[PDB]
Amino acid sequence: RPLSELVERGWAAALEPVADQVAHMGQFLRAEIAAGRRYLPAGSNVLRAFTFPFDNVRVLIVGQDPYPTPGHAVGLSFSVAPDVRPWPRSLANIFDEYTADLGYPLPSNGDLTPWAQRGVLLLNRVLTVRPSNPASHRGKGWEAVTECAIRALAARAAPLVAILWGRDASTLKPMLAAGNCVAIESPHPSPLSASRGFFGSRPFSRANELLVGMGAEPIDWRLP
Ligand SMILES: O=c1[nH]cc([N+](=O)[O-])c(=O)[nH]1
Ligand SMILES: [Cl-]
Ligand SMILES: [Cl-]
Numbered sequence: 001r002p003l004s005e006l007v008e009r010g011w012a013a014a015l016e017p018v019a020d021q022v023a024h025m026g027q028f029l030r031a032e033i034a035a036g037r038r039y040l041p042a043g044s045n046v047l048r049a050f051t052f053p054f055d056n057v058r059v060l061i062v063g064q065d066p067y068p069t070p071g072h073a074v075g076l077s078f079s080v081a082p083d084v085r086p087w088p089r090s091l092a093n094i095f096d097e098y099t100a101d102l103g104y105p106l107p108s109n110g111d112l113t114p115w116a117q118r119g120v121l122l123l124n125r126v127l128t129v130r131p132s133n134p135a136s137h138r139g140k141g142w143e144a145v146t147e148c149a150i151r152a153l154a155a156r157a158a159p160l161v162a163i164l165w166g167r168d169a170s171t172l173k174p175m176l177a178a179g180n181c182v183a184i185e186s187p188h189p190s191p192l193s194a195s196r197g198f199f200g201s202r203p204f205s206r207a208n209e210l211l212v213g214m215g216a217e218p219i220d221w222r223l224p
Helices: 009-014 016-034 089-102 113-117 142-155 203-213
Strands: 059-063 120-124 160-165 181-186
Touching: 009 016, 009 142, 016 142, 059 142, 089 203, 113 120, 120 142, 160 203, 181 203
Parallel strands: 059 120, 059 160, 160 181
Antiparallel strands: none
16 A cells, blocks of 8 residues: 555655655565564554644654553554553653643543644654564664654754654754754653653753744643
């Protein structure tokens, strides 16, 4: 199936340069299932970040790989389905910062769909994983796909704030080089690092400060 059938119109055009690569990933995934390996998220969710309009994106929040725990990954970085509990600890930490930064109550559940609807791109660098095997689809072909996506996003005339959590995300700074882009960076929300620079970083309000200063509307971050 061609890109225009899988993703939103603007993303299909942005991702044209990697259309063959995306087809190849579908072949890889089929071969995984034929070899008796599973993958997450569900097939229908793999490209989900690209189902929300390319032109509407104002904030990029980069992830690395999908959650490897069965039933967690949903195709948007960090998000979980509404019935998932307890929250993955990175997400719980994200939510702690959300409350402290913004003053909102704890969200009711871990579903970040409203952010995606509002132009927050929840993009993992690698879009699939074998269950219980963290980072197991590194090097399988997604990195070129998601690099194309980020470069296309950065090339738009429109404002963009990139939120870069952890060392691997910070290495994308070169590709956000353009005057229309601005990166904020901190240690990752995982418990390993969170108290050494993530908590108190105020990424949500600062992203809004930056967008307003670039002439854009702020993100309404409020979750149910
Ligand atoms: O979808 C994701 N969920 C969580 C992480 N993480 O905590 O590193 C990530 O990189 N991507
Ligand atoms: Cl498996
Ligand atoms: Cl807000």
